[PDB]
């Protein structure tokens, strides 16, 4: 009846500085469906971010992909911020180039 989101933040291709790419936040296994997911660039919310249509797995738990086009650089840090009823404060997960 209540399930916390699993969270993965990652890029569509292995990151290369100066080469355009997509930043993804994938949230899954959660219930209920109301959730807020934001992508952050150096702490600041990226404005143009899209997401897949609400769907769910065999066990009825929801999943969504949030994504945005981006061009990684050596200095820029990225993160995903997830806001859900099961979370007393939003969970912030950092982008690691090798995860």
């Amino acid at each position: 009846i209540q399930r916390t989101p699993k969270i993965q933040v990652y890029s569509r291709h292995p990151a290369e500085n100066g080469k355009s790419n997509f930043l993804n936040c994938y949230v899954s296994g959660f219930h209920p469906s109301d959730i807020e997911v934001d992508l952050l660039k150096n702490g600041e919310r990226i404005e143009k971010v899209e997401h897949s249509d609400l769907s769910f797995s065999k066990d009825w738990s929801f999943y969504l992909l949030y994504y945005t086009e981006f061009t990684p650089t050596e200095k820029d840090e990225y993160a995903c911020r997830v806001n859900h009823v099961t979370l007393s404060q939003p969970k912030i997960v950092k982008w690691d180039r090798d995860m």
Binding site: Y10, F22, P32, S33, L54, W60
Partner: protein, 274 residues
């Protein structure tokens, strides 16, 4: 191989904020192809895959008709559920539905589905015989008696053995180039010391379709089940999928470890070794 079609639907009631939000999506195998959102400006079923655009507006007129009907039914089901569970109109509640079919590689019917969940738990489901219902609680027993007396199962069986299977075969043919494709995983290894005496080996699979895949780590041929960190398979966003699996090894015993990758797009399983 085998194939499947699934329509998923969610209704979420929002008491003070007007009438329930309804979102439906349709899939062939791991590929989304249609969507409908009750809060969207369009009020139509929309395409989400290239191969479904070629359908004429009669398909679309009929599909948005059927899907709009479904949202109204599920809106009333949410109210009936409030009564059956004696719940207040204050709360938000969720009704999910899935239906669809599987076919074999010859395109023959294997399985039909038609099931509901309320607030994230099983409510009522049609059994594999496509004749009987599984009621998950007392509230669902009422619905079961109601649907048994009304012969709802026979209608669904007709849809699932007929229309649903024909649709699947059609989409599988029209979209043969993307749906019947197999993209094998692009693999590689990363390697990072985590101290003077230990290191992480991580095995990657990228750009594969369909999503089904197995990554396994062995040490001298011995499976490292309990000591393998594994992430859930995730969409890359371009229609393909990704996964990795990692182990912590003593340096430099890296050569004792093998990562094994199995996927339907590979002629033979891959073995990677640092």
């Amino acid at each position: 191989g085998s194939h499947s079609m699934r329509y998923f639907s969610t209704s979420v009631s929002r008491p003070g904020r007007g009438e329930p939000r309804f979102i439906a999506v349709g899939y062939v195998d791991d590929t989304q192809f249609v969507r409908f959102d009750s809060d969207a400006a369009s009020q139509r079923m929309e395409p989400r895959a290239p191969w479904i655009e070629q359908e004429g507006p009669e398909y679309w007129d009929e599909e948005t008709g059927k899907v709009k009907a479904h949202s109204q039914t599920d809106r009333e089901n949410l109210r009936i559920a409030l009564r059956y569970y004696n719940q207040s109109e204050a709360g938000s509640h969720t009704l999910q539905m899935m239906f669809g079919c599987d076919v074999g590689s010859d395109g023959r019917f294997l399985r039909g589905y038609h099931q509901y969940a309320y607030d994230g738990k099983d409510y009522i489901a049609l059994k594999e015989d496509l004749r009987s219902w599984t009621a998950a609680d007392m509230a669902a027993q009422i619905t079961k008696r109601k649907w048994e007396a009304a012969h709802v199962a026979e209608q669904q069986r007709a849809y699932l053995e007929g229309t649903c299977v024909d649709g699947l075969r059609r989409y599988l043919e029209n979209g043969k180039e993307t749906l019947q494709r197999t993209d094998p995983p692009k693999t590689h290894m990363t390697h990072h010391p985590i101290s003077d005496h230990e290191a992480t080996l991580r095995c990657w699979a990228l750009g594969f379709y369909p999503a089904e895949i197995t990554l396994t780590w062995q040490r001298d041929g011995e499976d490292q089940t309990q000591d393998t960190e594994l992430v859930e398979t995730r969409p890359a966003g371009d229609g393909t999928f990704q996964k990795w699996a990692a182990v912590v090894v003593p340096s430099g015993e890296e050569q004792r470890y093998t990562c094994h990758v199995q996927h339907e797009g590979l002629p033979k399983p891959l073995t990677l070794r640092w």
